[PDB]
Amino acid sequence: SSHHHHHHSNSMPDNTIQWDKDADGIVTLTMDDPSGSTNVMNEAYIESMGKAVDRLVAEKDSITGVVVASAKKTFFAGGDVKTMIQARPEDAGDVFNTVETIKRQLRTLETLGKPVVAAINGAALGGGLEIALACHHRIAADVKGSQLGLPEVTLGLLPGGGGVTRTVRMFGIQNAFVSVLAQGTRFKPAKAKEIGLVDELVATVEELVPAAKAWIKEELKANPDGAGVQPWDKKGYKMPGGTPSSPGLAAILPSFPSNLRKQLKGAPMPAPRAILAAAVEGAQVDFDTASRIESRYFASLVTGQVAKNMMQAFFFDLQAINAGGSRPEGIGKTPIKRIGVLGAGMMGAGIAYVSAKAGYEVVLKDVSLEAAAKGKGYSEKLEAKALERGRTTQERSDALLARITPTADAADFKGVDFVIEAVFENQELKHKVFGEIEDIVEPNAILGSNTSTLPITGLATGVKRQEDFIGIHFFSPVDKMPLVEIIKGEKTSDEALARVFDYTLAIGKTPIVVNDSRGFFTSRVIGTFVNEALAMLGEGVEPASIEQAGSQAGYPAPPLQLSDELNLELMHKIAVATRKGVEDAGGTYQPHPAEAVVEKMIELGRSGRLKGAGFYEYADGKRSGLWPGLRETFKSGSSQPPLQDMIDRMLFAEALETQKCLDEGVLTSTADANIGSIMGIGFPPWTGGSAQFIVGYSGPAGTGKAAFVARARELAAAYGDRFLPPESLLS
Amino acid sequence: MSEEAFIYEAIRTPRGKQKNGSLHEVKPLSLVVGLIDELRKRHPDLDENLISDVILGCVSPVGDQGGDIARAAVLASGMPVTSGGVQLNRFCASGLEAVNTAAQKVRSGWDDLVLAGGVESMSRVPMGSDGGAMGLDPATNYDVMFVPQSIGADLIATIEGFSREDVDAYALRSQQKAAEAWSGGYFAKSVVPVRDQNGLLILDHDEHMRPDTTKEGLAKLKPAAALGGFDDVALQKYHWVEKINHVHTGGNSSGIVDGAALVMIGSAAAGKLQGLTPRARIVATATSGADPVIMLTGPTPATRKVLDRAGLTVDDIDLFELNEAFASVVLKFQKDLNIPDEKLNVNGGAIAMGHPLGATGAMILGTMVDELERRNARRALITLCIGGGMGVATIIERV
Amino acid sequence: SEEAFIYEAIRTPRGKQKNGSLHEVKPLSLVVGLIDELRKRHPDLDENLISDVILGCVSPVGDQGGDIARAAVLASGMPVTSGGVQLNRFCASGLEAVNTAAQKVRSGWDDLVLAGGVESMSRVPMGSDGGAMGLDPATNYDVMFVPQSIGADLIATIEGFSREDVDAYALRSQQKAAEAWSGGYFAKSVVPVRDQNGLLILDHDEHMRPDTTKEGLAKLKPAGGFDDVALQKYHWVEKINHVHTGGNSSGIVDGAALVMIGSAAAGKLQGLTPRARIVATATSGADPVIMLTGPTPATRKVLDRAGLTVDDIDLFELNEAFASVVLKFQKDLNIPDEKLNVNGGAIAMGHPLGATGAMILGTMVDELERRNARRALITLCIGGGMGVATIIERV
Ligand SMILES: O=C1N=c2cc([N+](=O)[O-])c([N+](=O)[O-])cc2=NC1=O
């Protein structure tokens, strides 16, 4: 019943809200947390808003309207992740009471009998937007960088401060879930006003509070009976799209969970289904009962394991990387003038597009002008699709394509201070291609290589300045894949790391730093994923089950489909190089059981999508379906393991392989392993990464590293020694 | 388990079609009262005080079908106020469940004479009108992988290998045998024509029938769950299946119709005291189930259980009556138990005449009572699949 | 042939209508919570031997539509072969489910059956399902449809029950319900409701007003021309004395109840200990306008059917729909006052339509065992003029 966290009995949190009442009786609450640069929904805020809301009630006779504003660059962003990530199952009561107290304050503000206007000066994300949604009118400043939304589903949470309950009562169940809640979409101020999230816009922040007080003065004069009354608090309120008992919405309502299950492909992500349950259940009862249900589902997510995985990766791990965690400490800046891409394939053309989209002049060289020209057409094809979708102007798109200069002459790399080679996976080819350009480019130019497997130290011997040679690994398609794997050669200087680090941030991608070792991190770990699936196929498991297993595990692409695009001939020479290194050192090579399946498909002339046929069939450039001869070739169906066994084998192979990379020194931090596996090779976000998967594993037999080892030993006894955990995981 | 339960009367209304149907103007309460008044016409001297309960199956008990429609029939038809009245809902088997529950009440000895049957006016109260604890609860719907019956039937045809021509061949077979049964006079005394408050005829035949159905006409129909996502959900459980072959259309699936059926069940002493002649005996009943996503494989374990409970095998049964909800379900049932074709739905089924959810079980039960007498045969086994993957089966024996 | 035994009888607490604790709880969850409690009582129970689940529900629409019994089977992870059927016989649905389960067990064609009922009246108010007896003018004009409260006021007028008489019965129901709670009688059978996090939602019967006084009951006010309709049939009555209020009538609440029933062999096979035996069941009826007079011939019928009399019965449990109904029943059969609704009734604890019959049934199973008594007779009046009665014997 109270607006405060405690009601009994040293140390109290600071005040974060400034109070000001004008002569008209308009109170301006200015949130300004002194402990940071951004207002956050922490214990200091809850106490500060509690006093303010108590004061609004005590002085209601002398108060005519309220304005909620901020003194930071942003409006209000997020909650206390450090506290919510520590919530144990036994802490469910505390979590429940906290969000109930938070919403009790916003509900009093909402039913004050007076108009409350939010002056949104900057970003209002998560808890910030929830405060604004509790106001009766929302004005945002159309400023650069301003974002509005409820992105807590991306951390495994849900909008627990009224975000679910209010958006559903503003837009209906379907629109609120699809457009705002299910994916936590961020919106620019113009988009926010368009969908109903924001009511009015202003050009500058200085107009906000005056325009807010203006709207108060006009709302009081024009609509005195409905001032400070939300639409759902009026007698004739009718939910958009109907309530679950309305015949129209009831006809399509049972299909909402199945459509969500279609989207998620059966992956174990509990937050979206918790949002759907809270939304629908809330729409069946009054606002207050709906709000309390919202608290129970929220507490269910916060104390769960998936939210801790997601909070660990997408908040803590990402922030450490973005703060230069893998970047060398004392290195300055070196701006880039002209980028030179070698090769106009899918990789080289995608690299030139994301470089031009960032504002860089790119020279796109290939062996023929016809080839380089068709490479720039990749950028024109993406810009033409962004023009139709209306995401960029014709004036801005023309300047983007004008920074791409397709050529076939090596002399056109004159004045280039950043080289990104993306030619065929062959050492002496890259040696030759770099030799033809190392003297034409600037003497301080970075010599980057987009290599998947060949070690950078060996590639560096083909140039003169090996200190400026480095591995800059992108992922197809470059215009969408957000990771850049930076590979440190033995001769690579620390300054070269920082320049590629800064370049990665300039083009809007996330970097990880990896020490030189064949397979690096991404390619080596993703190999164990497709190898486990090809093993199952050779063991007689149904292909349809293998693909279903990969999708229900949470992967963006099933493993047989991914194998057809990695090309099986490339997988072959990867094992040949591995077999050569062992047998040249005098050892005995233990081949992976998948190698027999690769060489089998090579012999049958089905080496992948690039050569027209693989595990799938391809017609007119599109994938048709599983090759019917696949079942007869491998006796599909003779082995029928549990689906979870198939799922765990793929996840554990990568998790175990990540632990080796950490042990061998390939990776330097768990943050790089988690983000690198999520953004690079598509490790399921619900795991929080392939390293987090170990410390946060949850199965029927328990949770944590101990339960991971027990399950790994369970898999090893039934499928092979490769599932045995390393000594680093044992006690 | 002492008293033997006997069927004394089993009648039904004709089934009116969904679109521009003759029964659309007829309240479902009237369809039942009409059958009650027919029973009075056939036995004017029966002491209705000896009727202890009226049990009606109804899958959508809302609106015209809410408020315990069985009790409404007792009061509206002027039956004794001590005759009770209870509605039950066990999805498609509600009609047969009502009969089975009536028979089990007689066997316990604590009931003497019971009316049982069902009513479903699907043109007035569409399937789903009652909402549903599974549909209105995404937390439930997400966990238990809800899949509509039409997709389970397509999945059955895919696994078992029933082609589009196979299911359409059965659909043609159902239309033919239904027309032969009507033309042969088989339904003359059990299908009670519906009349208005003035005695004017409203419907006297199963107007959903398409007796001039051809193989080519069936092949021209389009497959039928139009929102999507359920196929992906289904294949998430049946992960070894790659593609669902949608083969079911409106011509090889049960018809949406209006109708009702009444069955009179009592002990030997009850019928003897009221001067009634027993037509058949309830030998055994059973209830089982199967996979909830495939949903429609429930009739098989319920049939094996009722056979084992009665100490019989498939050979001992003369007639098999299975609800024609979907052609593939019947072909799966026939394939599993090696049912001879000449013994399976010998007078047609729901594909031809319709499937009034809550009443279907009592309709096909009475259809077998009449066909056993017409053929002078001994045993018949009646079964229906159920939503949520349940099964109900009943064995009757001619007396 | 077979004898039917009760092995478990549990119920949720009853949450009130206004600002009730159970209003945020879907009725499906109420049932699933009780299923999970039975599993806790017998974790080694082979659920495959459960052949049906029978639930009473008077308003099977919305959250209660679509065969909520089958939903409980699927949502709780019970075997798909465990069945699931919803039935509606108005107020007796909960007891009708128990009787039907017993009769199925007696027929030998069911081995182990779960029975009970569920009614979330704060989410699905009564009348939400519609109905021909109310919404069809042709048949409404013939059956003389009258709300049950007026039938109760009519009973008090004929039998001569004053306003003080019905309030005096309402007082002892509050006193006896409070004494049963404080005495620990309900400590085992009332299963507290919790949310998905384990947090408590409700652990007691909110509708109870244990500080009720006779002076407070007098301050209450009594509740379409239905008076003229009733007096048209009962023509010898000049005026109906409206003595029933919200304090001497049943409370509108949310709740659910479950009862596990099976044969002696079925229980012995599963290591269960029988608690009581179902001796006999009966169904009868009475006037559909006065409505609530069905229990008297139904109780007489179940006594003759079991070869018993009132003197053979230790406890009488009649649902407290209205005070005059219970006083009419007590007067007709001359029930001793210390044998009637000994642990309080719906006036204090509430009447969750579809679940009530199973709740008061389990209430007598516990009280027979606690008193070490032999027989109890349970009965409920029903809308439309019906009556259901059951006799149980402690084992
Ligand atoms: O056709 C027959 N039908 C029978 C039916 C019954 N019946 O139970 O109704 C019995 N019998 O009573 O044993 C014997 C029968 N013997 C027959 O040969």
Q: Which residue has the tokens 């599974």?
A: B134
The fold of A336-519 is Rossmann fold (3.40.50)
- The sign of the torsion formed by the CA atoms of C293, C295, C301, C303 equals negative
The fold of C132-184+279-392 is Peroxisomal Thiolase; Chain A, domain 1 (3.40.47)
Neighbours of C192 (CB within 10 A): 13
For domain A1-335, which CATH number applies: 3.40.50.970, 3.90.226.10, 3.30.2320.30, 3.40.190.10?
Answer: 3.90.226.10
Residues forming CATH 3.40.47.10 domain(s) in chain C: 1-124+185-278, 132-184+279-392
Secondary structure (DSSP) of C129-181: TB-HHHH-HHHHHHHT---HHHHHHHHHHHHT--HHHHHHHHHHHHHHHHHHH
Give the integer Cα–Cα distance in Å for B228 and A254: 11
Q: Which residue has the tokens 């809301």?
A: A53
Bridge pairing between strands A124-125 and A148-149: parallel
Q: Which of B147, B231, B233 is the best substitution to test chain A (most A C-beta atoms within 10 A)?
A: B233
Give the integer Cα–Cα distance in Å for C128 and C139: 19
Instruction: Answer whether A179's CB lies under 8 Å from A126's CB.
Output: no
Give the integer Cα–Cα distance in Å for C10 and B306: 32
The structure was resolved to a resolution in Å of 2.5
For chain C, which chains pass the contact test of at least 3 CB pairs under 8 Å? Answer: A, B
Give the integer Cα–Cα distance in Å for C284 and B36: 20
Q: Which of C57, C91, C242, C244 is catalytic?
A: C91
Cα of B399 to ligand 1 centre, how many Å?
6
Helix or strand (DSSP H, E) at C58: none
Instruction: Answer whether A77's CB lies under 8 Å from A152's CB.
Output: no
Superfamily in which the B133-185+283-396 domain is placed by CATH: Thiolase/Chalcone synthase (3.40.47.10)
- Give the minimum alpha-carbon distance from A643 to chain B in angstroms, rounded to a whole number: 8
Nearest Cα residue to B193 out of B180, B184, B205: B205
Asked if C351 is an active-site residue, the reply is yes
Q: Residue C211 in 3-state DSSP?
A: coil
The alpha carbons of chain C give a radius of gyration, in whole angstroms, of 20
Q: What angle do CA C203, C207, C212 make, to 5 degrees?
A: 120
Give the integer Cα–Cα distance in Å for A500 and A492: 11
- For residue B260, the cross-strand partners are B119
Q: What angle do CA C49, C55, C60 make, to 5 degrees?
A: 140
- The sign of the torsion formed by the CA atoms of B15, B18, B23, B29 equals positive
SS (H, E, C) A414-428: CCCCEEEECCCCCHH
Give the integer Cα–Cα distance in Å for A176 and B183: 58
Neighbours of A587 (CB within 10 A): 9
Query: One-letter amino acid identity for A529?
Result: F
- Give the minimum alpha-carbon distance from C351 to chain B in angstroms, rounded to a whole number: 18
Name the maximum alpha-carbon separation found in chain C. Answer: 63
* Contact between chains at C199 and A245 (C-beta distance less than 8 A): no
Nearest Cα residue to A192 out of A221, A212, A171, A215: A171
Superfamily in which the B1-125+186-282 domain is placed by CATH: Thiolase/Chalcone synthase (3.40.47.10)
Neighbours of C311 (CB within 10 A): 7
Name which residue sits closest to atom 2 of ligand 1, judged by CA.
B378
CA distances from B215 to A258, B164, B181, B221, B259 (A): 35, 11, 20, 11, 28
B308: left (phi over 0), alpha (psi -120 to 50) or beta: alpha
Sheet hosting strand A148-149, strand order edge to edge: A76-77, A124-125, A148-149, A186-187
* Contact between chains at B236 and A261 (C-beta distance less than 8 A): yes
Give the integer Cα–Cα distance in Å for B144 and C188: 31
Give the integer Cα–Cα distance in Å for A654 and A677: 9
* Contact between chains at A296 and C63 (C-beta distance less than 8 A): no
Helix or strand (DSSP H, E) at A727: none
Give the integer Cα–Cα distance in Å for A373 and A371: 5
Give the integer Cα–Cα distance in Å for A157 and A79: 11
Name which residue sits closest to atom 6 of ligand 1, judged by CA.
B399
Give the integer Cα–Cα distance in Å for A394 and A391: 10
Give the integer Cα–Cα distance in Å for A256 and B230: 10
Give the integer Cα–Cα distance in Å for A489 and A200: 54
Q: What angle do CA B317, B97, C61 make, to 5 degrees?
A: 150
SS (H, E, C) chain B: CCCCCEEEEEEECCCEECCCCCCCCCCHHHHHHHHHHHHHHHCCCCCHHHEEEEEEECCCCCECCCCCHHHHHHHHCCCCHHHCCEEEEECECHHHHHHHHHHHHHHHCCCCEEEEEEEEECCCCCCCCCECCCCCCHHHHHHCCCCCHHHHHHHHHHHHCCCHHHHHHHHHHHHHHHHHHHHCCCCCCCECCEECCCCCEEECCCCCCCCCCCHHHHHCCCCCCCCCCHHHHHHHHCCCCCCCCCCCCCCCECCCEEEEEEEEEECHHHHHHCCCCCCEEEEEEEEEECCCCCCCCCHHHHHHHHHHHHCCCHHHCCEEEECCCEHHHHHHHHHHHCCCHHHECCCCCHHHHCCCHHHHHHHHHHHHHHHHHHHCCCEEEEEEEECCCEEEEEEEEEC
Nearest Cα residue to C126 out of C13, C252, C269: C252
Measured between alpha carbons, how far apart are the two ends of chain B, in Å? 19
Binding site, annotated residues of A = 38, 77, 79-82, 127, 152, 175, 179, 186, 191, 194-195, 319, 344, 346-347, 366, 423, 425, 430, 450, 452, 643-644
Nearest Cα residue to C177 out of C201, C197, C205, C199: C205
Residues forming CATH 3.40.47.10 domain(s) in chain B: 1-125+186-282, 133-185+283-396
Residues forming CATH 1.10.1040.50 domain(s) in chain A: 520-731
Nearest Cα residue to A310 out of A718, A686, A624, A609: A686
Instruction: Answer whether A158's CB lies under 8 Å from A297's CB.
Output: yes
- Tell whether domain A520-731 is in CATH 3.40.630.10: no
Q: What angle do CA A32, A34, A40 make, to 5 degrees?
A: 60
The two tokens of residue B302 are 């319920």
Q: Spell out which residues of chain B touch residue A637, defining contact as CB-CB under 8 Å.
A: 240
Q: Spell out which residues of chain C touch residue B57, defining contact as CB-CB under 8 Å.
A: none
Question: CB burial class (10 A; 0-12, 13-18, 19+) of residue B42?
Answer: middle
The two tokens of residue A700 are 């029927």
Question: CB burial class (10 A; 0-12, 13-18, 19+) of residue A14?
Answer: exposed
Instruction: Answer whether A406's CB lies under 8 Å from A364's CB.
Output: yes
Q: What angle do CA A151, A156, A158 make, to 5 degrees?
A: 55
Query: One-letter amino acid identity for C49?
Result: L
Would you state the torsion angle of the CA atoms of residues C39, C109, C368, C283, taken in this order, to the nearest 10 degrees?
A: 130
* Contact between chains at B140 and C79 (C-beta distance less than 8 A): no
Instruction: Give, for ligand 1, the residue of B369, B378, B379, B396 to mutate: max count of ligand atoms closer than 8 Å to Cβ.
Output: B378
Question: CB burial class (10 A; 0-12, 13-18, 19+) of residue A248?
Answer: exposed
CA distances from A539 to A544, A569, A593 (A): 14, 21, 9
Secondary structure (DSSP) of A89-148: GGGHHHHHHHHHHHHHHHHHHHTSSS-EEEEE-S-EETHHHHHHHTSSEEEEE--TT--E
The two tokens of residue A576 are 């040949």
Please tell me what DSSP assigns to residue C340: B
Q: Which residues of A379-400 are buried (b: 16+ CB within 10 A; e: fewer)?
A: beebbeebeeeeeeeeeebeeb
Instruction: Answer whether B39's CB lies under 8 Å from B189's CB.
Output: no
**Elucidated via:** X-ray
Give me the phi and psi of B234, to 5 degrees please.
Answer: -60, -50
Give the integer Cα–Cα distance in Å for A214 and A204: 16
SS (H, E, C) A606-660: CCECCCCECCEEEECCEEEEECCHHHHHHCCCCCCCCHHHHHHHHHHHHHHHHHH
Q: What angle do CA B277, B278, B284 make, to 5 degrees?
A: 175
The two tokens of residue B105 are 């009440």
Q: Spell out which residues of chain C touch residue A297, defining contact as CB-CB under 8 Å.
A: 196
Q: Which residue has the tokens 């959508």?
A: B60
Instruction: Answer whether B12's CB lies under 8 Å from B363's CB.
Output: yes
Nearest Cα residue to A135 out of A198, A46, A217: A198
Residues 6+ apart with CB under 8 A from A331: A494, A495, A497, A498
Q: Which residue has the tokens 């659309």?
A: B24
Give the integer Cα–Cα distance in Å for B37 and B74: 11
For residue A512, the number of C-alpha atoms closer than 13 Å in the C-beta half-sphere is 29
Residues on chain A bordering chain C, Cβ-to-Cβ distance under 8 angstroms: 89, 92-93, 96, 244-245, 281, 284-285, 289, 292-293, 296-297, 299-300, 303
Give me the phi and psi of A157, to 5 degrees please.
Answer: -105, -175
* Contact between chains at A280 and B136 (C-beta distance less than 8 A): yes
Asked if B92 is an active-site residue, the reply is yes
Give the integer Cα–Cα distance in Å for A378 and A391: 17
For domain C1-124+185-278, which CATH number applies: 2.60.40.10, 3.40.47.10, 3.30.750.24, 3.40.50.300?
Answer: 3.40.47.10
The two tokens of residue A630 are 């696949």
The two tokens of residue A33 are 């947390």
